[PDB]
């Protein structure tokens, strides 16, 4: 798995 550094936005579920 490879996540980006700085996703910014919360998943407002």
The oligomeric status of these chains comes to monomer
Helix content: under 10%
**What is the helix tally?**
0
Count of DSSP E strands?
Answer: 0
Indicate the radius of gyration in whole angstroms: 9 Å
Main sheet attributes: strand count, strand direction, barrel closure? none
Percent range for β-strand residues = under 5%
Structural class: little secondary structure
The gross shape turns out to be flat
- Terminal Cα span: 22 Å
PDB class: antimicrobial protein
Keywords: Antimicrobial Peptide, antimicrobial protein
Assembly: monomeric
Entry title: Structure of [T9,K7]indolicidin, a non glycosylated analogue of indolicidin
Report on this model:
The PDB classes it as antimicrobial protein. Keywords: Antimicrobial Peptide, antimicrobial protein. It forms a monomeric assembly. The entry is titled "Structure of [T9,K7]indolicidin, a non glycosylated analogue of indolicidin". The protein: non glycosylated analogue of Indolicidin. With 13 residues, the chain is mostly loops. The chain contains no helices and no strands.
């Amino acid at each position: 798995i490879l996540p980006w550094k700085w996703k910014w936005t919360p998943w407002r579920r």
